[PDB]
Protein: ATP-dependent 6-phosphofructokinase, platelet type
Organism: Homo sapiens
Amino acid sequence: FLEHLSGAGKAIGVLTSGGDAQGMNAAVRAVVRMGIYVGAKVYFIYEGYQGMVDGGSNIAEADWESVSSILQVGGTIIGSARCQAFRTREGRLKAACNLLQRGITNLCVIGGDGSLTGANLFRKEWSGLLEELARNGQIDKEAVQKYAYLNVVGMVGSIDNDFCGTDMTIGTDSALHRIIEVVDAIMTTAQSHQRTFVLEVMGRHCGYLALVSALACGADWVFLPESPPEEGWEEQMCVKLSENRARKKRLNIIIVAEGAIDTQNKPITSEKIKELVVTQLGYDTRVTILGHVQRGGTPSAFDRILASRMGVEAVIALLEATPDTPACVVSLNGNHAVRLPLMECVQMTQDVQKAMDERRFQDAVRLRGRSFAGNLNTYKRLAIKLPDDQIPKTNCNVAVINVGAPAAGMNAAVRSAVRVGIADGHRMLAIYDGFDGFAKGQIKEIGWTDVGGWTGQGGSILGTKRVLPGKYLEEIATQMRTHSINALLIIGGFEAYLGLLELSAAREKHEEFCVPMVMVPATVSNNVPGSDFSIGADTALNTITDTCDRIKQSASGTKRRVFIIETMGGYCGYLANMGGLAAGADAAYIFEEPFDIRDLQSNVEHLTEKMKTTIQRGLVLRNESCSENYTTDFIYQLYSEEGKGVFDCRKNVLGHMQQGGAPSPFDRNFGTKISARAMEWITAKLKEARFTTDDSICVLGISKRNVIFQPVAELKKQTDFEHRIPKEQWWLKLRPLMKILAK
Amino acid sequence: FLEHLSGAGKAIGVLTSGGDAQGMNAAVRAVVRMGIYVGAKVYFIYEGYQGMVDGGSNIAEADWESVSSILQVGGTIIGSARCQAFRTREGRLKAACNLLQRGITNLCVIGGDGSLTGANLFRKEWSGLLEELARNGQIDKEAVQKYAYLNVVGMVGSIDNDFCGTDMTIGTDSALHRIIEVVDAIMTTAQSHQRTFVLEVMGRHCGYLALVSALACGADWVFLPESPPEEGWEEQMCVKLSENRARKKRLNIIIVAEGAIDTQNKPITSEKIKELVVTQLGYDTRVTILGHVQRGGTPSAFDRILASRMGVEAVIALLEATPDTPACVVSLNGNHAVRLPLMECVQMTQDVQKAMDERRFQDAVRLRGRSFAGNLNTYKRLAIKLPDDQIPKTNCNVAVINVGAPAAGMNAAVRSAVRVGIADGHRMLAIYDGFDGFAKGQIKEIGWTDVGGWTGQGGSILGTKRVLPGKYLEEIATQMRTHSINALLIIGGFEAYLGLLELSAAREKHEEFCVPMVMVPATVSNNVPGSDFSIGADTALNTITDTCDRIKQSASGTKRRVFIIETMGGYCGYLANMGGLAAGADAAYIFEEPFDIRDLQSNVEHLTEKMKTTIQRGLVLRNESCSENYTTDFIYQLYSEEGKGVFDCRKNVLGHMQQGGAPSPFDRNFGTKISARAMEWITAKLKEARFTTDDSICVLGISKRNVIFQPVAELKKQTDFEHRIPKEQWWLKLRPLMKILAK
Amino acid sequence: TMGGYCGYLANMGGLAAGADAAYIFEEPFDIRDLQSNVEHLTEKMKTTIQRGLVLRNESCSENYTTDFIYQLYSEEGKGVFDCRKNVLGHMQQGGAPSPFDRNFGTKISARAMEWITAKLKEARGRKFTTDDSICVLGISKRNVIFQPVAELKKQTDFEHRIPKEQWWLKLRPLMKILAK
Ligand SMILES: Nc1ncnc2c1ncn2[C@@H]1O[C@H](COP(=O)(O)OP(=O)(O)O)[C@@H](O)[C@H]1O
Ligand SMILES: Nc1ncnc2c1ncn2[C@@H]1O[C@H](COP(=O)(O)OP(=O)(O)O)[C@@H](O)[C@H]1O
């Protein structure tokens, strides 16, 4: 719809300066391919800023073929480097001069707190740098007026995330993986020798990756620069570890921020701890500093997407910016990408440092992010069980259950749901084998020490069947009428929706279902209406994006070959699309977007023109059931006879391997995060009677920027029951974008 | 066949004491399930040796259901711990006593250098320990004669591999993964900031994982305790790094052994190096000590197989041992598992430390393994290019090529082949696009700096097509001359085999094919006759064994479900079998082992009796084409209608996702290792003219314990050309075993 | 219809039953010849004849199979016409022989028995090593003739097992113009 508006003729320079984080390539890829799409010239700037000063070999134009085959790699191919000869006007001039020699009037910088502030100045000094170049007569006197205005745009890029202008900065999810990967491995070595480990994650300033990772591996204790330990923590920690040996947890994991501190700026080294536990508890302890393995590695799905979206929203922001409009720093807020003023953002970032240095920790917290406070609170109120007798019991029965297909990171949702329940004063009942078990009586009260160590496990434990209750609506109520069940917590997918939607029926027929029930999105499909995201979704999506890279391997080894992969996920083309954009597929056929033999024919042509360039590979993803006639076989059958002579092609039907492996850190948190707020909505609405109106049975889920409880009742509207997909689907806005990155 | 004479009545005790290495669980799983198959009782011994002293809660019987769902986990579920109260007779007695109380007469210890020596004494003191127990009257006076003989067996288990009784110890391949995983990640952060890293791998005594890993990531320099650096290495290293910057290698990786030393016992810390390079080169440098992430993580395929095979060969050795027979320590030598004397094994291990302490490094090397010397030699002679002018050119043209399907770890074979060639005095010619390009003239001379950094990349670069050299023999002859080629190396699967054979009898014909030619196994199928292994085999097998665990996830979440996965690999059921044993499949239908509707029927029954126990999952692998009638659909169609009411079931057809991803560390080495010895066979046989016979065209591959060059001629015998698989296939001996383990 | 790669059965049967199109191997075709035929089938679904018949040679294309052909025609009609698929089994080569075969079998088989009786009398008062010592009798122009299996190696596609030059392909344009 906005493809028309495209500033052409002009050029843009792209560079990378700062903590080389994963997904950085996927960014410069969206920038180059988009910059060309709009009809402008895109130049490369090696060694970040240093490349500008130097020039010549550090500046070259980039073709569509250039940024190809780099999306699936960490670090940055453009190269990064700290340039000091730029922080000085005496040399910042050489940079400017070199730009006019190439005709670049716009620039896109992908760095960090400082790197951005660099261009913020260059932007201003420009009018002053051209005055000197024209004066000394080093550049054509004409140029002094053609390239008078200088537009720049910054981009969030560093695993630190010490930036409050955006919730997530390109790299976080990637580095977060690297951290969890190391831990999940270490946990097997500690669960044997029954010892305790102390880890040191990155983040000299922001203690973000230090908290999210911890919540992701159900850590025992965390040390953050923003929220230091209350005086007297030394004995309070040993209290925990002392109880963890008494509860039989032969494993203890300690997460420490690179810049840990206590009530006073006094640093909290990881050794100062190793000493504390072994010299006061006697437990064998080993501390390890996670190497730069946090900035390297393969970019996760989330990172590639965010990167590829930012790279575009940045290109448009460059030619859609006025000579007097503030410097913009594209960033993902809530769910939709939005540009923000650079200066104002660096301010917030610096302010966090200000508060911390002035023992104002309490304020420095609500300054890093309005989700950060909620995360710390969620973690702690879930990693500490105040004595059994100090918890005011409510004498109510709340039950949890897993209805639907198993989704990675589901056990994580149960761990939270249970603990946030017991710690709230309720007795927990676990319904095994989904509904199938519910009716059979497979119910058992579980405890706190029970759901311990699940945040890391995938698949399901309490079982889970897509078994609809619509016909066993009796055997169920009959069970609740013999367990004191006064609450319910479903965790699944669309199957669960129909579950509550049906339950509400037998209320004027069965006085037992007349209780509070809250469903939480838990499916790899993400077809759950009333939420833009689902638990275990980002996991499979990560498994898919990965597998596509390994398939793009055999497609490159053997020149001129195309692959057709059939991703699963009912009619919901979520998985199919997000994965196609994350692996850079030439096309992804989802159901939600109709297509005839022509949309297909007109795409085989584009695939042929690619078998001329360097990229002699081909990748096309197809939604499990996007069409009843054009099947995985059909698509392949056509592509073969229509290519015959130009390229080869095969087909693969991704099995359930997707929804299987260990849950992605994003699910390890999502599962734990939005499930607690689901448990309080219960405690809060269960206290109201301390239930009729069709609403006490809703579905908590991500909507705008934050989650909200929507009564399953009013969700009947925006939902396609025939294809089992929500009517309005947000990720369709990426459709035009996703494709312009094809050709 | 040999499962005839088994054994009952008596009982066996299993424990784990030492460096908890991955795949340890997969070991105790084979011991338990086998000890039961033989008809004996198997007891658990928690906390390694400490459990023996204690007793009671640290000793329990294990059912078939017990050791289930642990195979795919690192560390040890039995628990490990160092017990000092055992190194003393005063307490070693409490251990013995507790054993008679449970009726255990045999024992299997899975530990290390020290842990094993422990039972070696216990074995002897036994007669003396029962003398005191009967005297003091603590055990029934009768028992003093029923349990008079005490049989024990040790098992290689520790990632150190500081054991020369066996080539590989349960854990190596797994810890080697963890190491390579960390590196491959760090290399992206270093290839950006163009810096140098110094890594510190495990191995306080043996510098194994330090050499193998290095060779796997094409490291720049290594430090080993057995082969220290020649006096004057300080400047020699800087010489390298200085040239790597001159050759444009914006990345330098240094691998240091945990116990590195120089000509003298003087330790070589990783810092002592960080100082050296930065204070003498000025390059930015960061050193990181790979935490215990090397002992943790998920066990690799190689590890699980070796583990599962050792656990069995151990059980049989226990009941097949006489009262006066030396203590045995099962270990994999060459390719077939063979038991060896404990004491005699510990001697060798202790002797390596002896030599090192007496500056006898030269002997200490040929004492750790007859392959070690060949590996160190391979690495070094491939990481240092003596000046262009100091290399006595031979003025000969040797060309390499990739014929067949792309196999992970193929580029690695080219890197080696190329360098070992230039460093031998030959000019290297690279044939792109396999044969299809060979006839097209897609030939180009490559250099040393060209094939730099390939050992880590998967897929292929020189392209690779399954096209035979037949129909275009003339378009290959004419070209052959244009470059005046004399030697041709091949990196392909069965495809390449047919290549060499077609070129053999096609000599008298085209007089251009009369020269030395050597092929090397490079296919994920492993159907290449004349070799027990293939390049890229262990990779796909690792991806398969992984994917199966992710499927075994969704099969456990939804109780009572069976999956049918169709692995690929022509008729060669290699992939299908090894993967089935590595993931614990209930059955794997390969072609090499015929079966009727009865073997199938009699297996669905076994699957039903499992749906009664705790394990309500089901996994069955089927070879791509093991039967023309019983296809993946058929197998599923039967299993469904035959279970209907007891269990559900689905089917998945693994795509080319197998042979795709980054090559496994075992392939990264195999490719480089046995590829050089293939290049020397050329340099050695081309200097013989200082060429039309059956001994000029051969297939270099693994046979007995070591590789050997077998003329493609005499290989026509042991090869099934109709099904493209070697007649005699070694891994078929594991068939009975594989099945008794799964039941 | 079956019949290896030889589209004879498929063609003659399609012309005899008035099939809208018969896809044989001997006559290549892309997704366009297929597309441009679904259109003609739609314009017929306007007249009186609301039927559609398309024959496909057992293996005229490795990609475009009976299911493919049907899978396309279904989605490409959706709203104008329905469609199903049938794979004629060996029922074809089975029933009692047609009177033309009852004769052909007996007719040209006798003249094949005499060619033997006559070439037994040749070198009687006079061994066989020539090329015309093992020929194949078959209808060529107007009448049959004995062609030595030797010189038949030329006009024969061994890969698909069909003679190179096939006469009945002259009926291709005709066969189709009769299908509208
Ligand atoms: N105040 C400044 N003025 C101008 N350029 C700056 C300034 N601060 C940083 N830079 C530029 O950006 C580069 C990166 O600085 P750094 O603080 O390391 O970035 P980041 O915050 O991403 O880690 C410097 O080498 C310089 O080129
Ligand atoms: N002579 C001995 N007698 C009894 N136990 C011993 C003896 N030597 C070693 N052990 C046992 O093995 C432990 C030593 O660790 P070890 O097994 O050598 O580790 P690793 O598996 O890494 O080689 C001791 O704590 C003890 O439990």
